[PDB]
Symmetry: D2
Subunit: 232 residues, 4 copies
């Protein structure tokens, strides 16, 4: 079985191991210390995303400016969706599993300024629970999130990009079929999953101001983008 490799079995081998936050649990929580730790963890996960993306079949065949562009547009999609997946696998409670040593449960979301950020991220794990997403579906979906936005005037390797995206869409279809439902159910599930991918644009739009804000505060001490939607 594994002796006949598919695209998704390749995506499974290139998925990196979870990073630990390094958060000291022996000291009282504060929003300050959590957010500082998440900023450093966020930077490390961006590094992991670059290495991951370069291993995706097809990605390194795009023009180098295209690769940089897709990673710049999509990194928050990848991060929020992967966070959703870790939270979904951790528990059926309403929590965010940023790292195995930094889990934000309902208690920690009572800390000042935490909940209004976390509610947009909890939407992702809630959708994953509702749809009972499998690991192979998730892997295909996460690759597609890398391919979710392009410049309004197009990529340099636009024709190749279109072939790559269409292929990972097909791969998501095969992952769905593996759930052994019937054709009518597979058809509807494709809608459900790709609707979730579409809604990630809104998740990210709502999270970007908070990323901006924490940069201004803790680091600085202070239209041209086309969304590739599955459903209009």
């Amino acid at each position: 079985p594994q002796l006949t490799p598919t695209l998704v079995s390749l995506l499974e081998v290139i998925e990196p191991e979870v990073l630990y936050a390094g958060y000291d649990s022996s000291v009282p929580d504060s929003t300050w210390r959590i957010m500082t730790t998440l900023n450093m963890l966020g930077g490390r996960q961006v590094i992991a995303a670059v290495k991951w993306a370069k291993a995706i079949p097809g990605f390194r065949n795009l023009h180098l400016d295209d690769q940089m562009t897709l990673l710049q547009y999509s990194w928050m999609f990848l991060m929020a969706f992967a966070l959703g997946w870790r939270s979904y696998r951790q528990s059926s409670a309403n929590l965010l599993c940023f790292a195995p040593d930094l889990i934000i449960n309902e208690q920690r979301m009572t800390l000042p300024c935490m909940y209004d950020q976390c509610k947009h991220m909890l939407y992702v794990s809630s959708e994953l629970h509702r749809l009972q997403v499998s690991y192979e579906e998730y892997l295909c979906m996460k690759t597609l999130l890398l391919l979710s936005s392009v410049p309004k005037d197009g990529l340099k390797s636009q024709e190749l990009f279109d072939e790559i995206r269409m292929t990972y869409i097909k791969e998501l279809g095969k992952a769905i079929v593996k759930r052994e439902g019937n054709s009518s159910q597979n058809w509807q599930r494709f809608y459900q999953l790709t609707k979730l991918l579409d809604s990630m644009h809104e998740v990210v739009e709502n999270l970007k101001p908070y990323c901006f804000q924490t940069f201004l505060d803790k680091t600085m001490s202070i239209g041209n983008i086309k969304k590739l939607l599955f459903h209009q």
Copy 2:
């Protein structure tokens, strides 16, 4: 000799090894790719600074909010000063040695938008050449840059901070005396070195807008601080 440890011999053992940028030299340069690489390298160096600071004698005895505060205020001071040191040790040319595999020489500073950033960082290496700073002087100076700003209303462990800073000032004095000049020359050199530390406030003020700008562009795809000056 090394069998009698001093504070500076401790600072020498906790100094981390240089990070590599991972920059592909087989592909033409562009400002885009350099800046993207420097942003990722910058985040990794912040991680290194946190680990370093926690090993500095005295630092972990400050209140945890004070530690976070000092690292938040000073990280750009540490980064620009260490960059100055690596550039100063690399060559007497006007270059910035961000990493052994990413050196910005006069040629690469002709790339668009590069020089106006780099001129503020070249000031640091030029001052190091002018003063022929030793490694032990540098190590003491870099610790002092961690201690270069505090909140207007003070730190939680203000009294302990004052003792720590005064001790690393004394340690810089001992490093100066090791150059085996006479007392009149040692006195003047203390002024020269601490004047350079003072001027780092202006270096950082000039670099922060460019950090802000690259965050807005490549990441987002878009008064309460007292300076501790040596000379008024």
Copy 3:
């Protein structure tokens, strides 16, 4: 093309990056210092081999005892073969243990260096003579993991046999990409699998030196069936 994955393209993505030896070039060379450095580089390469093997499609499906057994038998096969490849790609007749630790002609004169390095240079020269491609090499290295089993067999013998047969077929596919006719592809499979068979002799000549370095520099002092392609 990469959008249609093959076993060999999976083998290409799990191939680990080359390790550096950490050898100080600014100090006079010494047989003592090279061998100590290689002992520590060797231990790190074992670690890399365990992680690589666990990602080989099919390998994790074998019984855990089988996994451990195949890694114990084959680690020196894997290391010498990969060394041959690195040396062939880096070129002349030089052993390229790491980018910062190359046994050049001068270092060969050091005592006991040549008598060890001669068996390893054989691997590098055969790879050069046969003009082995990267995809052939990756299939061959996987086969070396599967080159020896216990006399009594493995606990997952039936699965092992399927796994090994599949990577044999995968080496055939890599051979066919060299664009020869079928008669030449058949003959090239012989040439490549002869080299694989000859690794048993290479290894048997290298194990004593490994043993003596362990006794010297670390302690300061039968039931295995070879799976040969050609009898």
Copy 4:
């Protein structure tokens, strides 16, 4: 207080963080699997010891051959002593090889486990009996690096002798911090250095098992002066 650095506070900053074994707890234990895991953990701990030693004030000033010689003689001393410490701090009579690989009472029953672990548990129980402090432990571990030299001497013998005498004095300073009177401090120095001397016996009992595991699981098959504190 840290603002006045001592040799022992430098030893505290260069002490490496504990390594994890990577041992899968969700699978049935096996003597085979524990020993293979410990073999790879051992190799990684050697790497940590080399980096640690190069940062010991004075060590890099010895001749490079001396450095290599002291590390070859002493690595098992360092590993067993640090294991004793980790086990003493972590609890009962348990060997704490890594946070994820503890030899509990059940794992002791596995074949050949106890006969090895008994010599290592001796180290842990002595540390407990003597209530060794962390600063005493760090000085003692450094002395173990300096516990054996070649019969003919070292190339930097005079410097070595100064280095060793300085860490002997540093263990004395750590003893004095326990706030006993001078007569008790004198006697505690005897007790601690007796334990150091007894590591030679511990190691000599552990080397054979290291040898046999190497022959079994890796190959699949005099001129040294002990520097004793008490004759």
